[PDB]
């Protein structure tokens with residue numbers, strides 16, 4: 083059994099009294115709903131308030147989310163309930179605290195008394211000319227424009243980041259990683275850190291453009307999109323690796339599908355169309371996250387159909403990830419908990435078998451492991467499609483779930 087939970091949103095750093103402190107009061111509801119892993123925000127000092135422009139990595143006390151003692155208390159509470167803690171690891175880029183003689187911010191400070199992470203421009207990809215001194219290796223991946231990109235090919239960098247990562251586990255108690263902007267460095271570099279730190283899981287955020295047509299909607303065929311993600315997993319180590327990816331293919335397709343285009347939820351081979359359909363064990367599915375949803379709203383799930391999104395990911399193969407706001411602030415807490423209970427009670431896992439029974443514009447009906455049937459869509463009556471022996475156990479706006 084495995085169900086992830088994003089424990090924050092874009093506005094979290096603003097929480098009165100501290101985000102982690104408030105989260106102590108949410109622990110029991112999260113665990114009781116069947117969540118196994120909670121993804122927490124970048125915990126270090128950041129030039130930006132949300133944490134994605136990290137500087138002094140060991141300086142946890144400078145985080146807008148709360149200090150090291152407050153974070154420890156939270157993870158301890160999650161552990162007290164059998165819930166693991168995932169840390170958002172932002173290492174593609176980093177901000178240096180001080181300017182060098184060129185007037186460039188490239189003198190880094192790790193946050194400890196000695197020199198760990200006290201890097202200089204030699205650790206910045208030479209092709210990131212805005213900050214480098216031209217001496218480093220070329221970036222192994224994409225560049226993050228607003229900050230110095232790190233040369234993960236550098237010996238000291240790999241050594242010190244790995245040391246920092248092991249510390250996040252030993253000192254704070256973190257169990258796993260969420261690899262931010264994994265497009266920024268090669269899967270080979272991600273393998274160093276994953277293999278080198280033994281996280282329970284390491285979910286990579288590789289987010290690439292999804293092909294669309296003249297009308298702005300994603301093409302029905304998204305194989306190129308999931309192939310890219312599958313390729314990342316293969317390169318990082320495949321089945322043996324703790325590495326996996328967020329299923330952005332499923333997110334993009336589902337976004338469109340629920341607007342009466344449920345025929346999009348099956349590929350020509352009869353499989354789910356997202357990463358879920360090719361490598362379910364490595365597909366972390368979701369309805370929205372802090373970028374796509376929340377206040378950034380980069381690619382929000384149709385607001386009036388969010389529960390169809392959960393009825394879908396919570397009953398299907400792949401590892402579902404619930405978003406904080408959807409659980410506590412949209413009034414779906416009991417419905418979402420009920421869906422997780424059905425998943426768990428039926429032994430459904432990331433590798434369960436999926437048999438799609440109907441895939442028409444306004445009606446998607448699928449059967450999982452021959453034990454659960456789920457339906458989403460504006461079409462009310464799908465009774466004729468329901469196999470004998472099944473009876474409703476959960477239902478809501480345009481969705482219903484059956485059990486034997």
Ligand SMILES: C=C1O[C@H](O[C@H]2[C@H](O)[C@@H](O)[C@@H](O[C@H]3[C@H](O)[C@@H](O)[C@H](O)O[C@@H]3CO)O[C@@H]2CO)[C@H](O)[C@@H](O)[C@@H]1N[C@H]1C=C(C=O)C(=O)[C@H](O)[C@H]1O
Nearest residue numbers: 457459460461462463464465466474477478479480481482
């Ligand atoms: C059991 C059904 O559950 C789901 O239907 C929702 C529906 O989408 C909502 O819009 C809402 O409809 C209610 C209206 O709000 C109300 O004004 C009206 O008077 O009554 C309707 C019906 O309650 O609520 C329902 C219930 O949550 C789901 O989308 C739908 O497909 C599903 N029906 C299926 C299950 C059965 C066994 O209980 C069969 O009887 C049906 O044939 C089967 O399609």
Ligand SMILES: C=C1O[C@H](O[C@H]2[C@H](O)[C@@H](O)[C@H](O)O[C@@H]2CO)[C@H](O)[C@@H](O)[C@@H]1N[C@H]1C=C(C=O)C(=O)[C@H](O)[C@H]1O
Nearest residue numbers: 134135172262263264265287289290291292372373380
């Ligand atoms: C905020 C995200 O931006 C990028 O994703 C873009 C995709 O590449 C593009 O295909 C799509 O059309 O638009 C996306 C949104 O701009 C990055 O690839 C992605 O990693 C990034 N999300 C994380 C990175 C940050 C910088 O550290 C943060 O601002 C985000 O909050 C992260 O979740």
Ligand SMILES: C=C1O[C@H](O[C@H]2[C@H](O)[C@@H](O)[C@H](O)O[C@@H]2CO)[C@H](O)[C@@H](O)[C@@H]1N[C@H]1C=C(C=O)C(=O)[C@H](O)[C@H]1O
Nearest residue numbers: 305308309312313315316320321322359360361362363
């Ligand atoms: C399970 C496999 O998933 C991916 O393969 C997909 C291909 O990339 C895609 O082009 C093809 O059409 O569909 C495939 C999915 O059916 C990975 O590339 C592939 O490596 C992976 N197979 C590995 C995983 C295992 C456990 O799931 C092992 O038993 C296999 O031997 C691995 O090769």
Ligand SMILES: [Ca+2]
Nearest residue numbers: 194195196200
């Ligand atoms: Ca130092």
Ligand SMILES: [Ca+2]
Nearest residue numbers: 226229230231
């Ligand atoms: Ca950069």
Ligand SMILES: [Ca+2]
Nearest residue numbers: 223224231266
């Ligand atoms: Ca990079």
